[PDB]
Amino acid sequence: MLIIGERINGMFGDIKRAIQERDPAPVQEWARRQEEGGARALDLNVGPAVQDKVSAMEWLVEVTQEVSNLTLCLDSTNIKAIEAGLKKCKNRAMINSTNAEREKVEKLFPLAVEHGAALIGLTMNKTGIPKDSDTRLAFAMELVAAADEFGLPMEDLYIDPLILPANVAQDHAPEVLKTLQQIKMLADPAPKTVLGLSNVSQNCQNRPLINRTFLAMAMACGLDAAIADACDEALIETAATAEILLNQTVYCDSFVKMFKTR
Amino acid sequence: MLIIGERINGMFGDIKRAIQERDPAPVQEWARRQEEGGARALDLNVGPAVQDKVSAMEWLVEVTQEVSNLTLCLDSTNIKAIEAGLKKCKNRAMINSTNAEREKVEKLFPLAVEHGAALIGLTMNKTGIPKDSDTRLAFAMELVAAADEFGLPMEDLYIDPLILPANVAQDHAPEVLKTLQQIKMLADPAPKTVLGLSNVSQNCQNRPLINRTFLAMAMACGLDAAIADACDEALIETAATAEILLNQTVYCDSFVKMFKTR
Ligand SMILES: CN1c2c(nc(N)[nH]c2=O)NC[C@@H]1CNc1ccc(C(=O)N[C@@H](CCC(=O)O)C(=O)O)cc1
Ligand SMILES: CN1c2c(nc(N)[nH]c2=O)NC[C@@H]1CNc1ccc(C(=O)N[C@@H](CCC(=O)O)C(=O)O)cc1
Ligand SMILES: [Ca+2]
Ligand SMILES: [Ca+2]
């Protein structure tokens, strides 16, 4: 399980301010804390508030890689910002993300291949987020075909079935799990999967509990990565424990500590 | 998710003592504690120490139902002990258990049907516990077939893939999850599934964490019941949260208390 730190996101007050005033401190500290927690990748989202998002993404990348060697997951719907971000990265990055819209596919897949970056693909298009796991799957298969079309190593494709809040879109959770299990059955080389975990507990009571439980359930269905709270110690324990239970990582008494220091 | 309290088991020092000295107190206190924790069924095992195991089972049933209206899960390999127990039960019971051995099947299935009791079926026979999910599923199918043969309503059949310790039999864990998943894809009305959860963490470190993480994973694979620690609050939290994430129970802020006081 690859945990992608979610905290360096412009939606958070401290990050929004850091970006606006160009204060590196808050960002670099979150990069450190998330890595200490067990994250092996960092999501970088500039947020919708800043004016020049292209310039903001470059800044997030520069100040982050100064204190971290972790993989950078450039999170933005602005392709110019993604491209500008990729050019600043000193290490392999992740593009977050592309959807099944052909227009975006033929721009982001070649871009990912060009930079040898991983690519996250959302199971949806202009038509919206589908509920049925079969519709989600069809979009997943469109991304898979695209990976073969543009020469992207299937192992560099992370399909995101898009999890929603369990309190107002509860019937989506089981559909997401089913979509993951289906993608898991694909023949080798099979694509990977990822989720914006925290979205499942938005506005719910005891979000950490809900996040933890869904992560474990999702991993049983093949989940490979999760954009989540890397500073949540109980979440990290779950990830570590789940690997053991799927026999992905050999058991030893200090399996949690080994997960955080691998 | 049906939690079957595991604590009333002769392997535990206090229960062994209570049975041998015929002291109702310890047993009745555990019955109340487990129900308060959220269990809706109580496993009753006399343990191997006591000499007269048939009268010990009748005694456990008598002292337990005296303070509890919960379904009693009679845990014993001695058919006579099971029969004497069922005869003492004032409420519907559960038999734990029968295996895939035909000799066991033709005695236990008709027994469960005669008493209108539920029946737990282990995916194993005299050749042992199979590691591969293919063979586990094969025995599961024999159990489903026997249920139709002897007239046991399918929802009264709980198939147990038999989970083993994650530190010495780690490769069994994923095979169990796969079995559960395939069991749910046999035919509706499909049979139910159950596990002796605590076995997965035997001799491991961070036992509660391993137990609850696996429960969540198993529920995503269809687990319907579990013989576990009904007094472990974190375990109950997971059970309650999993139901929500599988859309089996409508979400509300008090979903945990709601599960317990259900
Ligand atoms: C849509 N999510 C998502 C994605 N990328 C992919 N591929 N998939 C996804 O589902 N990128 C962004 C987001 C994942 N990251 C996050 C980050 C924070 C919170 C969150 O819970 N935020 C707080 C905001 C706190 C504050 O603003 O002060 C919240 O309560 O909403 C949720 C998801
Ligand atoms: C084999 N398990 C099992 C079953 N029935 C079915 N159908 N399936 C099962 O897997 N019945 C008994 C047991 C389930 N109950 C239990 C009860 C306790 C412990 C346990 O962890 N015991 C302690 C012993 C503690 C003591 O002796 O004081 C241990 O660490 O082994 C595990 C499973
Ligand atoms: Ca996978
Ligand atoms: Ca089920």
Coordinates of C-alpha atoms and ligand atoms in Angstrom, one line a residue:
Chain A
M1 CA 0.0 0.0 0.0
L2 CA 1.4 3.3 -1.2
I3 CA 0.2 6.2 1.0
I4 CA 0.1 9.5 -0.8
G5 CA 0.1 12.4 1.8
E6 CA -3.1 14.5 1.2
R7 CA -2.2 17.5 3.5
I8 CA -0.3 19.8 1.1
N9 CA -3.6 21.0 -0.5
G10 CA -4.7 24.6 -1.1
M11 CA -8.1 23.8 0.4
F12 CA -6.5 23.9 3.9
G13 CA -6.2 27.4 5.4
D14 CA -2.5 27.2 6.3
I15 CA -1.5 26.0 2.8
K16 CA -3.7 28.5 1.0
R17 CA -1.9 31.2 3.0
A18 CA 1.6 29.7 2.4
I19 CA 1.0 29.6 -1.3
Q20 CA -0.4 33.2 -1.4
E21 CA 2.4 34.7 0.7
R22 CA 4.9 32.3 -0.7
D23 CA 5.9 31.1 2.8
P24 CA 7.8 27.7 2.4
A25 CA 7.8 26.8 6.1
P26 CA 4.2 25.5 6.4
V27 CA 4.6 23.4 3.3
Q28 CA 8.0 21.9 4.1
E29 CA 6.9 21.0 7.6
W30 CA 3.9 19.1 6.3
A31 CA 6.1 17.4 3.8
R32 CA 8.3 16.3 6.7
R33 CA 5.5 15.2 9.0
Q34 CA 3.7 13.2 6.3
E35 CA 6.9 11.4 5.4
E36 CA 7.6 10.7 9.1
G37 CA 4.1 9.2 9.2
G38 CA 4.7 6.7 6.5
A39 CA 3.8 8.5 3.3
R40 CA 6.0 7.6 0.3
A41 CA 4.4 10.2 -2.0
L42 CA 3.0 13.7 -1.6
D43 CA -0.1 15.1 -3.2
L44 CA 0.4 18.8 -4.2
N45 CA -2.8 20.7 -4.9
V46 CA -2.6 24.5 -5.1
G47 CA -6.3 25.0 -4.4
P48 CA -8.8 27.2 -6.3
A49 CA -8.0 30.5 -4.4
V50 CA -4.6 31.4 -5.8
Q51 CA -4.6 33.4 -9.1
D52 CA -1.6 32.0 -11.0
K53 CA -2.1 28.3 -10.4
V54 CA 0.7 27.4 -12.9
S55 CA 3.2 29.5 -10.9
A56 CA 1.8 28.1 -7.7
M57 CA 2.3 24.4 -8.7
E58 CA 5.9 25.1 -9.7
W59 CA 6.5 26.7 -6.3
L60 CA 4.9 23.8 -4.4
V61 CA 7.2 21.4 -6.3
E62 CA 10.4 23.4 -5.7
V63 CA 9.9 24.0 -2.0
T64 CA 8.8 20.4 -1.4
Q65 CA 11.6 18.6 -3.2
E66 CA 14.0 20.7 -1.3
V67 CA 13.1 18.9 1.9
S68 CA 11.8 15.6 0.5
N69 CA 12.8 12.9 -2.0
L70 CA 9.3 11.4 -2.0
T71 CA 7.3 11.1 -5.2
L72 CA 5.3 14.2 -6.1
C73 CA 1.7 13.7 -7.0
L74 CA 0.8 16.8 -9.0
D75 CA -2.9 17.3 -8.3
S76 CA -4.6 19.7 -10.7
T77 CA -7.2 20.0 -13.5
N78 CA -5.1 22.6 -15.2
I79 CA -2.9 20.8 -17.7
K80 CA -0.5 23.8 -18.1
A81 CA 0.1 23.7 -14.3
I82 CA 0.7 19.9 -14.5
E83 CA 3.2 20.3 -17.3
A84 CA 5.0 23.2 -15.6
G85 CA 5.1 21.1 -12.4
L86 CA 6.6 18.1 -14.2
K87 CA 9.4 20.2 -15.6
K88 CA 10.4 21.3 -12.1
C89 CA 10.4 17.8 -10.5
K90 CA 13.8 16.4 -9.9
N91 CA 12.3 12.9 -9.3
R92 CA 9.7 10.7 -10.8
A93 CA 6.2 12.1 -10.4
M94 CA 2.5 11.2 -10.4
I95 CA -0.1 13.1 -12.5
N96 CA -3.4 13.5 -10.7
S97 CA -5.2 13.2 -12.9
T98 CA -6.9 12.4 -16.2
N99 CA -10.4 11.1 -16.8
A100 CA -11.9 9.1 -19.7
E101 CA -12.6 12.2 -21.8
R102 CA -10.8 11.5 -25.0
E103 CA -9.6 15.1 -25.1
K104 CA -7.8 14.8 -21.8
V105 CA -6.6 11.3 -22.5
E106 CA -4.6 12.2 -25.6
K107 CA -2.9 15.0 -23.8
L108 CA -2.2 13.4 -20.4
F109 CA -1.2 9.9 -21.4
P110 CA 1.5 11.1 -23.8
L111 CA 2.5 13.6 -21.2
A112 CA 2.9 10.9 -18.6
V113 CA 4.9 8.7 -21.0
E114 CA 7.1 11.7 -21.9
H115 CA 8.1 12.2 -18.3
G116 CA 8.0 8.6 -17.2
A117 CA 5.5 9.6 -14.6
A118 CA 2.7 7.6 -13.1
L119 CA -0.8 8.5 -14.2
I120 CA -4.0 8.5 -12.1
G121 CA -7.2 8.0 -14.2
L122 CA -10.7 8.8 -12.9
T123 CA -13.5 6.5 -14.0
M124 CA -15.7 9.2 -15.5
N125 CA -16.1 11.7 -18.3
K126 CA -18.1 14.8 -19.1
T127 CA -21.2 12.7 -18.3
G128 CA -20.4 12.7 -14.6
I129 CA -19.5 10.2 -11.9
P130 CA -21.3 6.9 -12.6
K131 CA -22.9 4.9 -9.7
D132 CA -23.1 1.4 -11.3
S133 CA -19.8 -0.5 -10.9
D134 CA -20.2 -1.7 -14.5
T135 CA -20.2 1.8 -15.8
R136 CA -17.1 2.6 -13.7
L137 CA -15.4 -0.5 -15.0
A138 CA -16.1 0.4 -18.7
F139 CA -14.3 3.7 -18.0
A140 CA -11.5 1.8 -16.3
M141 CA -11.2 -0.4 -19.4
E142 CA -11.0 2.8 -21.6
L143 CA -8.1 4.0 -19.5
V144 CA -6.4 0.6 -19.8
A145 CA -6.8 0.6 -23.6
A146 CA -5.3 4.1 -23.6
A147 CA -2.3 2.9 -21.7
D148 CA -1.6 0.3 -24.4
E149 CA -2.4 2.9 -27.1
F150 CA 0.1 5.5 -25.9
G151 CA 2.7 3.2 -24.6
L152 CA 2.2 3.8 -20.9
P153 CA 3.4 0.8 -18.7
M154 CA 0.2 -0.6 -17.3
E155 CA 1.9 -0.6 -13.9
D156 CA 2.1 3.1 -14.1
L157 CA -1.6 3.5 -14.4
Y158 CA -3.6 4.1 -11.2
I159 CA -7.3 3.8 -11.8
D160 CA -9.5 5.8 -9.4
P161 CA -13.1 4.7 -9.1
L162 CA -13.9 7.9 -7.1
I163 CA -15.2 7.3 -3.6
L164 CA -17.9 9.6 -2.2
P165 CA -19.2 10.6 1.2
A166 CA -20.9 7.6 3.0
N167 CA -23.5 9.8 4.6
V168 CA -25.1 11.2 1.5
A169 CA -23.8 8.9 -1.3
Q170 CA -23.6 5.7 0.8
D171 CA -24.7 3.4 -2.1
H172 CA -21.5 4.3 -4.0
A173 CA -19.1 2.7 -1.5
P174 CA -20.1 -0.9 -2.3
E175 CA -20.0 0.0 -6.0
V176 CA -16.4 1.3 -5.6
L177 CA -15.3 -1.9 -3.9
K178 CA -16.9 -4.0 -6.7
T179 CA -15.1 -1.9 -9.3
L180 CA -11.8 -2.4 -7.5
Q181 CA -12.3 -6.2 -7.3
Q182 CA -13.1 -6.3 -11.1
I183 CA -10.0 -4.3 -12.0
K184 CA -8.0 -6.6 -9.7
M185 CA -9.0 -9.6 -11.8
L186 CA -7.5 -8.2 -15.0
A187 CA -4.6 -10.2 -16.5
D188 CA -0.9 -9.3 -16.0
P189 CA 0.4 -6.7 -16.4
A190 CA -2.6 -5.4 -14.5
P191 CA -3.2 -1.7 -13.7
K192 CA -3.0 -0.3 -10.2
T193 CA -5.8 1.4 -8.2
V194 CA -6.0 4.5 -6.0
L195 CA -8.6 6.4 -4.0
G196 CA -9.0 9.8 -2.4
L197 CA -9.7 8.0 0.9
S198 CA -10.8 11.0 3.0
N199 CA -13.7 11.7 0.7
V200 CA -15.6 8.7 2.1
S201 CA -16.1 10.2 5.5
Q202 CA -16.7 13.9 4.6
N203 CA -19.0 15.5 7.2
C204 CA -19.5 12.1 9.0
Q205 CA -18.9 11.3 12.6
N206 CA -15.6 9.7 13.5
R207 CA -14.0 10.2 10.1
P208 CA -10.8 8.4 11.1
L209 CA -12.8 5.2 12.0
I210 CA -14.6 5.4 8.6
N211 CA -11.4 6.1 6.7
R212 CA -9.5 3.2 8.4
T213 CA -12.3 0.7 7.8
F214 CA -12.8 1.6 4.1
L215 CA -9.0 1.4 3.5
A216 CA -8.8 -2.1 4.9
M217 CA -11.9 -3.1 2.8
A218 CA -10.5 -1.5 -0.3
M219 CA -7.1 -3.2 0.1
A220 CA -8.8 -6.5 0.2
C221 CA -10.2 -5.6 -3.2
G222 CA -6.8 -4.8 -4.6
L223 CA -6.3 -1.2 -3.7
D224 CA -2.6 -0.2 -4.3
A225 CA -2.5 3.5 -3.2
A226 CA -4.5 5.9 -1.2
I227 CA -4.4 9.7 -1.0
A228 CA -5.0 10.0 2.7
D229 CA -3.9 11.5 6.0
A230 CA -0.4 10.2 6.5
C231 CA -0.3 11.8 9.9
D232 CA -3.1 9.5 11.1
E233 CA -1.2 6.8 13.0
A234 CA -4.2 4.5 13.2
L235 CA -4.6 4.7 9.5
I236 CA -1.0 3.8 8.9
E237 CA -1.4 0.8 11.3
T238 CA -4.3 -0.4 9.2
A239 CA -2.4 -0.1 5.9
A240 CA 0.5 -2.0 7.5
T241 CA -1.8 -4.7 8.9
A242 CA -3.7 -5.1 5.7
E243 CA -0.6 -5.9 3.7
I244 CA 0.3 -8.6 6.2
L245 CA -3.2 -10.1 5.9
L246 CA -3.0 -10.2 2.1
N247 CA 0.4 -11.8 2.4
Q248 CA 2.0 -8.9 0.5
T249 CA 4.5 -8.3 3.3
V250 CA 5.9 -11.1 5.5
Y251 CA 4.9 -11.0 9.1
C252 CA 7.1 -9.9 12.0
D253 CA 6.2 -8.6 15.4
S254 CA 7.1 -5.0 14.5
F255 CA 5.3 -5.0 11.1
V256 CA 3.9 -1.5 11.8
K257 CA 7.4 0.0 12.4
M258 CA 8.8 -1.8 9.4
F259 CA 6.0 -0.3 7.2
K260 CA 7.0 3.3 8.3
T261 CA 10.7 2.8 7.8
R262 CA 10.9 0.5 4.7
Chain B
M1 CA -22.7 -8.5 10.9
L2 CA -23.7 -11.0 13.6
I3 CA -21.2 -11.1 16.4
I4 CA -21.0 -14.4 18.3
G5 CA -19.4 -13.9 21.7
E6 CA -16.4 -16.2 21.9
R7 CA -15.5 -15.8 25.7
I8 CA -17.6 -18.6 27.2
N9 CA -15.0 -21.2 26.2
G10 CA -13.5 -23.9 28.5
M11 CA -10.0 -23.0 27.2
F12 CA -10.2 -19.9 29.3
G13 CA -9.1 -20.5 32.9
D14 CA -12.0 -18.8 34.5
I15 CA -14.6 -20.7 32.4
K16 CA -12.8 -24.0 33.0
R17 CA -12.9 -23.3 36.7
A18 CA -16.6 -22.3 36.7
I19 CA -17.6 -25.5 34.8
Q20 CA -15.6 -27.9 37.0
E21 CA -16.9 -26.3 40.2
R22 CA -20.3 -25.6 38.7
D23 CA -20.2 -21.9 39.6
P24 CA -22.8 -20.1 37.5
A25 CA -21.5 -16.6 38.3
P26 CA -18.5 -16.3 36.0
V27 CA -20.5 -17.7 33.0
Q28 CA -23.5 -15.5 33.5
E29 CA -21.4 -12.4 34.0
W30 CA -19.7 -13.1 30.6
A31 CA -23.0 -13.7 29.0
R32 CA -24.3 -10.2 30.1
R33 CA -21.0 -8.5 29.2
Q34 CA -20.9 -9.9 25.7
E35 CA -24.5 -8.9 25.0
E36 CA -23.8 -5.4 26.3
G37 CA -20.8 -5.2 24.0
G38 CA -23.0 -6.0 21.0
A39 CA -23.0 -9.7 20.6
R40 CA -26.3 -11.3 19.5
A41 CA -25.2 -14.9 19.9
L42 CA -23.0 -16.7 22.5
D43 CA -20.6 -19.5 21.7
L44 CA -20.6 -22.2 24.4
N45 CA -17.6 -24.5 24.6
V46 CA -17.0 -26.7 27.6
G47 CA -13.3 -27.1 26.9
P48 CA -11.2 -30.3 26.9
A49 CA -10.5 -30.4 30.6
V50 CA -13.8 -31.4 32.1
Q51 CA -14.5 -35.2 32.2
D52 CA -18.3 -35.3 31.6
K53 CA -18.6 -33.0 28.6
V54 CA -22.2 -33.8 27.9
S55 CA -23.5 -32.7 31.3
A56 CA -21.2 -29.7 31.1
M57 CA -22.8 -28.5 27.9
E58 CA -26.3 -28.9 29.3
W59 CA -25.1 -26.9 32.4
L60 CA -23.6 -24.1 30.3
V61 CA -26.9 -23.8 28.3
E62 CA -29.0 -23.8 31.5
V63 CA -27.0 -21.1 33.4
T64 CA -26.6 -19.0 30.3
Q65 CA -30.2 -18.8 29.0
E66 CA -31.2 -18.1 32.6
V67 CA -29.8 -14.6 32.1
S68 CA -29.7 -14.3 28.3
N69 CA -32.3 -14.6 25.5
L70 CA -29.4 -14.7 23.0
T71 CA -29.0 -17.4 20.4
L72 CA -26.7 -20.1 21.8
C73 CA -23.9 -21.3 19.6
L74 CA -23.1 -24.8 20.8
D75 CA -19.4 -25.4 20.1
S76 CA -18.4 -29.0 20.4
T77 CA -17.0 -32.0 18.4
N78 CA -19.0 -34.4 20.5
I79 CA -22.4 -35.0 18.8
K80 CA -24.0 -36.3 22.0
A81 CA -23.0 -33.1 23.8
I82 CA -24.6 -31.1 21.0
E83 CA -27.8 -33.1 21.1
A84 CA -28.1 -32.8 24.9
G85 CA -27.4 -29.1 24.6
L86 CA -30.1 -28.4 21.9
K87 CA -32.6 -30.3 24.0
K88 CA -31.9 -27.8 26.9
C89 CA -32.2 -24.7 24.7
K90 CA -35.4 -22.7 25.1
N91 CA -34.5 -20.4 22.2
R92 CA -33.4 -21.2 18.7
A93 CA -29.7 -22.4 18.7
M94 CA -26.7 -22.7 16.4
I95 CA -24.6 -25.8 16.0
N96 CA -20.8 -25.4 15.9
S97 CA -20.1 -27.5 14.0
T98 CA -20.1 -30.0 11.2
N99 CA -17.3 -30.5 8.6
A100 CA -17.3 -31.8 5.0
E101 CA -17.0 -35.4 6.1
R102 CA -20.1 -37.2 4.9
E103 CA -20.4 -39.2 8.1
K104 CA -20.6 -35.9 10.0
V105 CA -22.9 -34.3 7.4
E106 CA -25.7 -36.9 7.5
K107 CA -25.9 -36.7 11.3
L108 CA -25.5 -33.0 11.9
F109 CA -27.6 -31.5 9.1
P110 CA -30.6 -33.6 10.0
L111 CA -30.0 -32.7 13.7
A112 CA -30.0 -29.0 12.8
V113 CA -33.2 -29.4 10.8
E114 CA -35.0 -31.3 13.5
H115 CA -34.3 -28.5 16.0
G116 CA -34.8 -25.7 13.6
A117 CA -31.2 -24.6 14.4
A118 CA -28.5 -22.8 12.5
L119 CA -25.5 -24.9 11.4
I120 CA -21.8 -23.9 11.0
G121 CA -20.0 -25.9 8.3
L122 CA -16.2 -26.0 8.2
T123 CA -14.6 -26.2 4.8
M124 CA -12.5 -29.3 5.6
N125 CA -12.8 -33.1 6.0
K126 CA -10.7 -35.9 7.3
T127 CA -7.8 -35.0 4.9
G128 CA -7.3 -31.7 6.8
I129 CA -7.7 -28.0 6.3
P130 CA -7.0 -27.2 2.6
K131 CA -4.8 -24.1 2.0
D132 CA -6.0 -23.4 -1.6
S133 CA -9.2 -21.5 -1.9
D134 CA -10.2 -23.9 -4.8
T135 CA -10.5 -26.8 -2.4
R136 CA -12.0 -24.7 0.4
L137 CA -14.7 -23.7 -2.1
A138 CA -15.1 -27.3 -3.1
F139 CA -16.0 -28.3 0.4
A140 CA -18.2 -25.2 0.8
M141 CA -20.2 -26.4 -2.2
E142 CA -20.7 -29.8 -0.6
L143 CA -22.1 -28.0 2.4
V144 CA -24.5 -25.9 0.3
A145 CA -25.5 -29.1 -1.5
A146 CA -26.1 -31.0 1.8
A147 CA -28.3 -28.1 3.0
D148 CA -30.6 -28.5 0.0
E149 CA -30.5 -32.3 0.5
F150 CA -31.6 -32.3 4.1
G151 CA -33.9 -29.3 4.0
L152 CA -31.8 -26.7 5.9
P153 CA -32.8 -23.2 4.8
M154 CA -29.8 -21.7 3.1
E155 CA -29.7 -18.7 5.4
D156 CA -29.4 -21.1 8.4
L157 CA -26.1 -22.3 6.9
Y158 CA -22.9 -20.6 8.0
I159 CA -19.8 -21.7 6.0
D160 CA -16.5 -21.3 7.9
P161 CA -13.4 -21.1 5.6
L162 CA -11.3 -21.7 8.8
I163 CA -8.8 -18.8 9.3
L164 CA -5.4 -19.6 10.8
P165 CA -2.7 -17.4 12.6
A166 CA -1.2 -14.7 10.4
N167 CA 2.3 -15.2 11.8
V168 CA 2.7 -18.9 11.0
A169 CA 0.1 -19.6 8.4
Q170 CA 0.1 -16.2 6.7
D171 CA -0.6 -17.6 3.2
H172 CA -4.0 -18.9 4.4
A173 CA -5.3 -15.4 5.1
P174 CA -5.7 -14.3 1.4
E175 CA -7.1 -17.7 0.5
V176 CA -9.8 -17.3 3.1
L177 CA -10.8 -13.9 1.7
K178 CA -10.9 -15.4 -1.8
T179 CA -13.1 -18.3 -0.6
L180 CA -15.5 -16.0 1.2
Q181 CA -15.8 -14.0 -2.1
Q182 CA -16.5 -17.0 -4.2
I183 CA -18.9 -18.4 -1.7
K184 CA -21.0 -15.3 -2.2
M185 CA -21.1 -16.0 -5.9
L186 CA -22.6 -19.5 -5.9
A187 CA -26.4 -18.9 -6.1
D188 CA -29.2 -17.0 -4.3
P189 CA -30.4 -17.5 -1.8
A190 CA -26.7 -17.8 -0.9
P191 CA -25.4 -19.3 2.3
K192 CA -24.0 -17.2 5.1
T193 CA -20.3 -17.2 6.2
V194 CA -18.6 -17.1 9.6
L195 CA -15.1 -17.2 11.0
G196 CA -13.4 -17.8 14.3
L197 CA -11.8 -14.4 14.1
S198 CA -9.4 -14.4 17.0
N199 CA -7.5 -17.3 15.5
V200 CA -6.0 -15.0 12.9
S201 CA -4.0 -13.1 15.5
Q202 CA -3.0 -16.1 17.8
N203 CA 0.5 -15.6 19.1
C204 CA 0.9 -12.3 17.2
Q205 CA 1.6 -8.8 18.5
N206 CA -1.1 -6.1 18.3
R207 CA -3.8 -8.8 18.3
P208 CA -6.8 -6.4 18.5
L209 CA -5.5 -4.5 15.5
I210 CA -5.0 -7.6 13.4
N211 CA -8.4 -9.0 14.4
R212 CA -10.4 -5.8 13.5
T213 CA -8.4 -5.2 10.3
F214 CA -9.2 -8.7 9.0
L215 CA -12.9 -8.5 10.0
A216 CA -13.3 -5.4 7.8
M217 CA -11.5 -7.1 4.9
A218 CA -13.7 -10.2 5.4
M219 CA -16.9 -8.2 5.5
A220 CA -15.9 -6.6 2.2
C221 CA -15.8 -10.2 1.0
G222 CA -19.2 -11.0 2.4
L223 CA -18.6 -12.2 5.9
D224 CA -22.0 -12.5 7.7
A225 CA -21.0 -13.5 11.2
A226 CA -17.9 -13.9 13.4
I227 CA -17.1 -15.6 16.6
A228 CA -15.0 -12.9 18.2
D229 CA -14.3 -10.8 21.3
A230 CA -17.7 -9.0 21.8
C231 CA -16.1 -7.0 24.6
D232 CA -13.4 -5.4 22.3
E233 CA -15.0 -2.0 21.6
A234 CA -12.7 -1.3 18.7
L235 CA -13.7 -4.6 17.1
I236 CA -17.4 -3.7 17.4
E237 CA -16.7 -0.2 16.0
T238 CA -15.2 -1.8 12.9
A239 CA -18.2 -4.2 12.5
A240 CA -20.6 -1.3 12.8
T241 CA -18.6 0.8 10.3
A242 CA -18.2 -2.0 7.8
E243 CA -22.0 -2.4 7.6
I244 CA -22.4 1.2 6.7
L245 CA -19.6 1.1 4.0
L246 CA -21.3 -1.9 2.4
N247 CA -24.6 -0.1 2.5
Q248 CA -26.2 -2.9 4.6
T249 CA -27.3 -0.4 7.3
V250 CA -28.3 3.2 6.6
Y251 CA -25.8 5.8 7.9
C252 CA -26.5 7.9 10.9
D253 CA -24.2 9.8 13.2
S254 CA -24.8 7.3 16.0
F255 CA -24.2 4.2 13.8
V256 CA -21.9 2.6 16.4
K257 CA -24.3 2.9 19.4
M258 CA -27.1 1.9 16.9
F259 CA -25.3 -1.3 16.1
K260 CA -24.8 -2.2 19.8
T261 CA -28.3 -1.4 21.0
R262 CA -29.9 -2.9 17.9
Ligands
LIG1 C1 -11.2 14.6 -4.3 N1 -10.0 13.9 -3.7 C2 -9.3 13.1 -4.7 C3 -8.0 13.6 -5.4 N2 -7.4 12.9 -6.3 C4 -7.9 11.7 -6.8 N3 -7.3 11.0 -7.7 N4 -9.1 11.2 -6.2 C5 -9.8 11.8 -5.3 O1 -10.9 11.3 -4.8 N5 -7.5 14.8 -4.9 C6 -8.2 15.6 -3.9 C7 -9.1 14.8 -2.9 C8 -8.3 14.0 -1.9 N6 -7.7 14.7 -0.9 C9 -8.4 15.2 0.2 C10 -7.8 16.2 1.0 C11 -8.5 16.7 2.2 C12 -9.8 16.2 2.5 C13 -10.5 16.7 3.7 O2 -11.1 16.0 4.4 N7 -10.4 18.1 3.9 C14 -11.0 18.9 5.0 C15 -10.6 20.3 4.7 C16 -10.1 21.0 6.0 C17 -9.9 22.5 5.9 O3 -10.3 23.0 4.8 O4 -9.5 23.2 6.8 C18 -12.5 18.7 5.0 O5 -13.0 18.5 6.1 O6 -13.1 18.7 4.0 C19 -10.4 15.2 1.7 C20 -9.7 14.7 0.6
LIG2 C1 -11.2 -22.4 16.5 N1 -12.2 -21.3 16.6 C2 -13.3 -21.6 15.9 C3 -14.6 -22.1 16.5 N2 -15.7 -22.4 15.7 C4 -15.6 -22.2 14.3 N3 -16.7 -22.5 13.6 N4 -14.5 -21.7 13.7 C5 -13.4 -21.4 14.4 O1 -12.4 -20.9 13.8 N5 -14.6 -22.4 17.8 C6 -13.5 -22.1 18.7 C7 -12.5 -21.0 18.1 C8 -13.1 -19.6 18.2 N6 -12.9 -19.0 19.5 C9 -11.7 -18.5 20.0 C10 -11.6 -18.3 21.4 C11 -10.4 -17.9 21.9 C12 -9.3 -17.6 21.1 C13 -8.0 -17.1 21.7 O2 -7.4 -16.2 21.2 N7 -7.5 -17.8 22.8 C14 -6.4 -17.6 23.6 C15 -6.4 -18.5 24.8 C16 -6.5 -17.6 26.0 C17 -6.5 -18.4 27.3 O3 -6.4 -19.7 27.2 O4 -6.5 -17.9 28.5 C18 -5.1 -17.8 22.7 O5 -4.3 -16.9 22.7 O6 -5.0 -18.9 22.1 C19 -9.4 -17.8 19.7 C20 -10.6 -18.3 19.1
CA3 CA -3.6 -4.1 -6.9
CA4 CA -22.9 -12.5 3.0

